[PDB]
Write a protein that holds these residues in place. Sequence first.
Motif, PDB file in Angstrom:
ATOM      1  N   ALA A   1       0.409  -1.313   0.715  1.00 16.26           N
ATOM      2  CA  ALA A   1       0.211   0.416   0.146  1.00 16.26           C
ATOM      3  C   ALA A   1       0.673   1.357  -0.455  1.00 16.26           C
ATOM      4  O   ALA A   1       0.385   2.077  -0.664  1.00 16.26           O
ATOM      5  CB  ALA A   1      -0.913  -0.333   1.543  1.00 16.26           C
TER       6      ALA A   1
ATOM      7  N   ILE B   1       2.319   1.601  -3.316  1.00 12.91           N
ATOM      8  CA  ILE B   1       1.163   2.344  -4.465  1.00 12.91           C
ATOM      9  C   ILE B   1       0.991   3.461  -4.414  1.00 12.91           C
ATOM     10  O   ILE B   1       0.480   4.631  -5.080  1.00 12.91           O
ATOM     11  CB  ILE B   1       0.264   1.735  -4.487  1.00 12.91           C
TER      12      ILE B   1
ATOM     13  N   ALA C   1      -3.791  -1.979  -6.752  1.00 17.67           N
ATOM     14  CA  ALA C   1      -4.364  -2.433  -5.383  1.00 17.67           C
ATOM     15  C   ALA C   1      -4.363  -4.383  -5.490  1.00 17.67           C
ATOM     16  O   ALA C   1      -4.600  -4.869  -5.087  1.00 17.67           O
ATOM     17  CB  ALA C   1      -5.266  -2.367  -5.096  1.00 17.67           C
ATOM     18  N   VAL C   2      -4.825  -4.531  -6.948  1.00 19.27           N
ATOM     19  CA  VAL C   2      -4.463  -5.499  -7.068  1.00 19.27           C
ATOM     20  C   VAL C   2      -3.580  -6.345  -7.486  1.00 19.27           C
ATOM     21  O   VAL C   2      -3.216  -7.944  -6.370  1.00 19.27           O
ATOM     22  CB  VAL C   2      -5.089  -5.808  -8.607  1.00 19.27           C
TER      23      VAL C   2
ATOM     24  N   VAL D   1      -0.750  -6.759  -4.701  1.00 16.21           N
ATOM     25  CA  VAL D   1      -0.840  -6.452  -3.351  1.00 16.21           C
ATOM     26  C   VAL D   1      -1.326  -7.638  -3.151  1.00 16.21           C
ATOM     27  O   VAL D   1      -0.771  -8.556  -2.456  1.00 16.21           O
ATOM     28  CB  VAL D   1      -1.278  -5.165  -2.883  1.00 16.21           C
TER      29      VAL D   1
END
Lengths: 53, 66, 263, 298, 299, 253, 35, 52
Positions: free
Chosen positions: C118, C121, C223-224, C226
């Motif tokens: 997170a 990103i 987010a995908v 992670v």
Amino acid sequence: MRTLQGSDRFRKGLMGVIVVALIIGVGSTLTSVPMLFAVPTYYGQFADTGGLN
Amino acid sequence: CGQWRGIANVPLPGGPGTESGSMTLYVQMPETLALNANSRVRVRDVFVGRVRKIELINWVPTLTVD
Amino acid sequence: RFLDSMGHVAWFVVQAIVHVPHAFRHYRRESLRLVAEIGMGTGAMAVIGGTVAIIGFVTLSAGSLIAIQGFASLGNIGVEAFTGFFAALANIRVVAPVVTGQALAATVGAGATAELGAMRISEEVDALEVMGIKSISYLVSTRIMAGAIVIIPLYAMAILLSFMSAQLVTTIFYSQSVGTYEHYFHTFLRVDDVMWSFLEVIIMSVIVMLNHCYFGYFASGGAVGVGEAVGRSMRTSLIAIVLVVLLASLALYGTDPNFNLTV
Amino acid sequence: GVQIDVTGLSKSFGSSKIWEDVTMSIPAGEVSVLLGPSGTGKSVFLKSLIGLLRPERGSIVIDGTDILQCSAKELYEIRTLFGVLFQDGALFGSMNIYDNTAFPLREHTKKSESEIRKIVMEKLDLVGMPNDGHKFPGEISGGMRKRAGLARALVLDPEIILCDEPDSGLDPVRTAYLSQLLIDINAQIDATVLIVTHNINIARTVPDNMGMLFRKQLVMFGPREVLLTSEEPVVKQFLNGRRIGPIGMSEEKDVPPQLQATPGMPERKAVARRKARVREILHTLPPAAQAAILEELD
Amino acid sequence: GVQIDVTGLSKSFGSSKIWEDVTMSIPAGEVSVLLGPSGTGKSVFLKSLIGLLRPERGSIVIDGTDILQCSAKELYEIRTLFGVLFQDGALFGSMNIYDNTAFPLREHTKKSESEIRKIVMEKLDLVGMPNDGHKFPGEISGGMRKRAGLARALVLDPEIILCDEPDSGLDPVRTAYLSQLLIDINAQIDATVLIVTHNINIARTVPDNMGMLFRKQLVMFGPREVLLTSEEPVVKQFLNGRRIGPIGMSEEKDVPPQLQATPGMPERKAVARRKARVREILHTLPPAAQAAILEELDR
Amino acid sequence: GQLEKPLATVGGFFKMSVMTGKALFTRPFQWKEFVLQSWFLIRVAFLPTLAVSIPLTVLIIFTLNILLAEFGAADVSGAGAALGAVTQLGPLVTVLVVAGAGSTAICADLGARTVREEIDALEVLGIDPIERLVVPRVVASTFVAFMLNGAVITIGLVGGFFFGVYIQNVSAGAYVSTLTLLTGFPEVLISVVKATLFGMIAGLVGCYRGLTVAGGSKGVGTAVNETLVLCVVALFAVNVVLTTIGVRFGTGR
Amino acid sequence: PYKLAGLILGLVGVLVLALTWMQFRGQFEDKVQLT
Amino acid sequence: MLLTRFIKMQLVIFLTLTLVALVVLALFYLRLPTWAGLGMYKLNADLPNSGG
């Protein structure tokens, strides 16, 4: 989804947890239940158990 | 398949009697006392061999020993 | 490729290790915050107890399994007074280290991978690098220090709860006398085994934290990505934990089994 | 503010190239904006100017030192002049706005808690967040996150400020508010602000200098008056938002009076320096452009 | 093109309310736009119009059937009227653009593969992708993803189209291209197009009707002429992108000619109906707005 | 009220599982998606399964052999070698390498579909996700868990044999002839039941968490982590219950 | 220095495995052989 | 810096749990005083044979 996030999750959770608990309880005592497995129980008198379990 | 007698009665690799130069003998026992295959052959109580097959020929047990 | 990937992970672990004194001196409040976050969980998992509750539940389950199957088999054979002797050597040698490692991997390592992904990103690592901060020293070294500080209490609780579960199952549900269980437990348990097990768990926790920090630090794909990083890190952590425990047990007891019953 | 001299910059992720042979000269203290169609890698250019990304070739000279070729020890001192506003603020959710703002002052300066509190409260007042220092980054909106990130970027008295898509997630009104804030900041501290965006209101209202990226190349870079009177088809089409021009439907197929600082702020020295540079450049432009710029400057 | 009747619509994510009492009557076949400051929950409204979300109050009476009070089985036919363009297109990455386009045709109709190929090729050529059938959604860019989502929405002859932020991730030129495409589509099929965006270029050339959400309310809904000559502080501030007005710096601190259809496209019937309604509306408008709209209509 | 918060998610999971069962037994089955998900789970959780099963069974065999050699009864080691491997090592390695790999992969995939509005794209087209997505994934999870449990038990037994014979110098005939001493049909049957239930529960939890992802910038990672933790806890509890049930029957008794 | 560190990591792993195997077989401690 | 007093609460409860677990494990389960030799004196014996 609409169905997943609907305002019926509390009752669904109650019913599901009750069903899961009942399944676990029945599965544990499925062999020992008297309704499905009932046999006459006889008795004997002994002077000692002699290590009997 | 037809002769399958179990995982205990199948010859296993390795150990004494499986190397090159081992000799094969047949022992006609009166009975085997439920002896399994892959048991130990002992000379002077020393593990020096293995029993391969325990086929019964004409009602008298025969052991193949390496 | 393969050598290049091994070199990249080797550079990451070397850089994380060499910055531990720098993190210890410069960043103390961050280390304390990470210690609290690892010990008591984060997010929605923190309200139930965090890592402590998950570790406790899994170790209680493992101890219960040991006691259950052990007592059943020994009662079938007949020599059932050895359960306390059988349970302890089951927990220390094989079960408790591996099980605690997998639970620690899951909770702490997946949380660390998610947090670092997170941050990557959300361009927070870029923000740290712009402000003249060693990102690896600030993040990964702090995670390593927090894990090293937190692992010993966690594994102590894990061992305590595994022993308690085994004893409770054997002496309450199976109605074995507590005296016989305690005798065969305290007679055939060596504290040396527990000390070596603690060392194994410390090394394993350091390796797991390094692996998960590597997977979370170099995340990509929004987010995908992670979640995929979390899955890959979990697979690697399982393999590493089992390998570490196997190697340590092979080295320790290869010649001296450290157990005597007969003459 | 200080000047940035980009020369022959080029980026490429594998076989695909982002932009090739970018040459610029961003003047000292003046607001500059880089524009282009979507998918032209402007944020990669913004990152490359500070050293987060490494262009294959080129040079980015600041003062007299090429920051592209320098040891990381020297880079951590070069990046002291910078202040970066990311598309969402890039705040840390573990600590509040006050601690996020005071973080650069606690990492570099050997100041006291009272002095740090004074300067942090001042810089939070500058960006319209006087009493929001106790809130966390997850408890504030996107515009507030941009304000907090800017406040964090202002504490160490920056010389260069980088802005990554200030219009992201903002309607035109809040974008206008943020643009006025940027103009006011350049009026006050006189920092070299560089912005990357594809917004047209910002492109035609805020900056002193503008540049254009199209088809993995730089079309032209120059002052505000030079580009707003440009007869280049790409620049005219993009600045007027037209549908007829070189720019296609997708990536595969490929004078406004300016914003004045709030009354009470100090004079923007950038305006006068830009006008002087335009006066110097004026003799190398087409006669219609020269006449239009003369009318604007008079 | 069918009419959407929204009355007393309200939403609430927890103790907060996204918007309240949104009462509007979307016309039939006329392109319409709902705008407002960022964070006003316009995509929530757009998804509630079709039934992806469930508003806490109100009704959305499409045709005569209030779709909020309707069973799930019936919603298998109401949504046949719809065609939805999501922000990124919401394509399926496991299948190519051709299969993505043909997916609802194979799901609903009974047509042979020859007819499927004919319709899919026709609609792909319609949206500027004649030879990009074989590509996957990962390979194409955001503009092509929007075009592919539109093409998938145009295969079952929709009577309503819902566009969610068609300007997201697009520079003004590509936004102008997509706006022209939407105007052409409404010219050809006369579907009730509804767009949600805070873009100002879109909100001055494309729409026939416009409405604005501000501070968890709907300030006004009306035709293009009525909204572009309205002396309402919020509307006048927003439509010009100004800085002095009720809209604050952040969420916590709170005529143009119009786009014409491409030459060679069938005449838009929404323009004439819009003007016919505008005259009856102007019957009650302020005199300055009346004069401005009368000047615009008499050009 | 404190218990009412997790109970809502519990009810959502239970209702979703009930709908999944109804779609399995009522609506036509999706053979293509089932095949794709089966191969995906196999390719994502086969090599780690062996790489965790081989050292773990080697460690267990080493510990058992040294303890029994000191005990004096080193000929019955194979008994224990079977007894663990069939009933605990198999299902537990299945738990680890299914929850860690396949359940997390399913959660991540469905979260990716959710954040990209593909679930809404299916829902506005009249299609039901629970029949088109969840059912093949749960069935594939069950199938792969069954096969992986079988492979784990076989590989563990063979590796234990080879290690004990070629390293610790135990007798091979004692290993192979004592395997069935404590393990029979009840043990393999309870192992099969454990594997099937573990796979089904892991698939259900992964699908439910993937469909209810929170988006944002950490929502998918948080969902995957919660999926993994919930799967580990639930599978350990179910393993305890099924172990009690299985030892109630017993081969020795 | 990635390729150098990959070799260093591989050598460290191989040395750890070899030392564990030697300690398993008791190669370090010395014993006398009697018949 | 930091000191939100909730992280402090987590830290103090974790430290309490740490001390309780360590003391209980050391005394009631591992018997560290017995292993080290606390409260015990040394005694020797000579045997003709070990007897195992």
